[PDB]
Amino acid sequence: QGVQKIGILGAMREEITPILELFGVDFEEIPLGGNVFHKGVYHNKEIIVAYSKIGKVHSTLTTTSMILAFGVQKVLFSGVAGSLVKDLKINDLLVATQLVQHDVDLSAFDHPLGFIPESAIFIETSGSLNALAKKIANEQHIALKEGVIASGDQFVHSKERKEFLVSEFKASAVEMEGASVAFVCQKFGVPCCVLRSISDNADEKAGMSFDEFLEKSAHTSAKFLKSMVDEL
Amino acid sequence: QGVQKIGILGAMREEITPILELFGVDFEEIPLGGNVFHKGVYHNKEIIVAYSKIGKVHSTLTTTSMILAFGVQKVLFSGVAGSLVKDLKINDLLVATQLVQHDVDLSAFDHPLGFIPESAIFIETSGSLNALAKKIANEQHIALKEGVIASGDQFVHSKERKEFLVSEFKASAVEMEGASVAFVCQKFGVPCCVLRSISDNADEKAGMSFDEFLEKSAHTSAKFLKSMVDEL
Ligand SMILES: C#CCCCSC[C@H]1CN(Cc2c[nH]c3c(N)ncnc23)C[C@@H]1O
Ligand SMILES: C#CCCCSC[C@H]1CN(Cc2c[nH]c3c(N)ncnc23)C[C@@H]1O
Secondary structure, three states: OOOOOEEEOOOOOOHHHHHHHHHHHOOEEEOOOEEEEEEEEEEEEEEEEEEOOOOHHHHHHHHHHHHHHHHHOEEEEEEEEOHHHHHHHHOEEEEEEEEEEEEOOHHHEEEEOOOOOOOOOEEOOOOHHHHHHHHHHHHHOOEEEEEEEEEEEEEOOHHHHHHHHHHOOEEEEOOOOOOHHHHHHHOOOEEEEEEHHHHHHHOHHHHHHHHHHHHHHHHHHHHHHHHHHOOO | OOEEEEEEOOOOHHHHHHHHHHHHOOEEEEOOOOOOEEEEEEOOOEEEEOOOOHHHHHHHHHHHHHHHHOOOOOEEEEEEEOOOOOOOOOOOEEEEEEEEEEEOEEEEHOOOOOOOOOOOOOOOOOOOHHHHHHHHHHOOOEEEEEEEEEEEEEEEOOOOHHHHHHHHHHHEEOOOOOOHHHHHHHHHOOOOEEEEEEOOOOOHHHHHHHHHHHHHHHHHHHHHHHHOOOOO
């Protein structure tokens, strides 16, 4: 019965800026493994906030550091994502129920795409945290979608790649970190929730949309993440 | 002036089997984060041996665990790889001077392939360890090549992808973990050496070659890694 330690992660500095602002507490900055961890006290909880830097290796490293070096008991991810489905519009929020590494390819050995031996195609997130997210969204009258998020080390900006992610994985959104964060948490037995707000449609205009909406979408996700932390 | 702690990593169980056999000491098995770490004493050094499981996320996690949980001061990687160049034949040994994540693509933002903001295309390994490898190889009359290794989350088995790795990155060999291991070590300031023995030619017949030569090539790499540890 110590103080609860909660890890809060984004991929980009822009994804954690609104998180730090919204919590409004003093943070100690602690450098480790190329990341800066922002350690603060919020209600009866220790919150450790960081951005990993972009992509799967960065996010895997940072999540592992949060767990081993800072002793976090839960990890909440907040950031932006590309939409793969018509009903997920710019600014909409989605919670990932499962995630996949969409760029993994061991098909030379007849493995399905996404699969690595001693693992699985789909990585689950925390049912209790996802239930909390849904409960809060319903009380606040916020549309919150749930579905599969695909993660890879490419920025997706083509109709062809979008359609593959939908056909192969039944994914709803695409990003570059969720699956790796969720994977690390699964390996250590740490509950994980991945929240994303849509910044673009993962098509030919995605780069321009992303630049336009990163701030607003990052804020939308951050505000929702704070509302979850308020109930922990 | 404690005992030197050396991390020894492979990707697959088959890559560490000969390592454990060759060191010939008693190991304590310690489970953590979905890996099993084999901790032993060899001469005046503590050796921590593990296989990460395949690919970039697995290897990033395991390397981070080795550094944070086991306090390793150096990391030596041993395993097998696909050859991209005519002069690297089955069983030949290569030490990686730089590594790249060949599947990273942020070209939508006009970044070169392999590049992520706040990082670099090429990750360096330890010059002092690579010099040690070359010195030992020369004394033992072992051909040891050096060059760039490309790492990604795909098993490469096509002429077309091989040629891309050579054209884009001037890579000599391909695998799925070196760049991520070397990256983590760079972030923590830990010296890293990546050794690989060729198992296949990364072409249409690579899967069959890999299955045939994994054992022999893994042993070749392991034997050389042991010879390095003998000089540390
Ligand atoms: C800085 C800079 C330019 C490179 C930004 S890469 C895109 C970042 C946003 N994030 C989520 C994302 C939003 N739209 C996406 C898309 N269309 N494809 C992949 N990921 C995303 C992944 C990564 O951290
Ligand atoms: C078990 C099993 C079947 C899947 C094995 S994936 C290949 C493993 C060997 N390793 C190195 C490698 C050897 N030949 C390769 C190739 N042709 N492409 C990518 N990696 C490799 C990467 C990964 O750990």
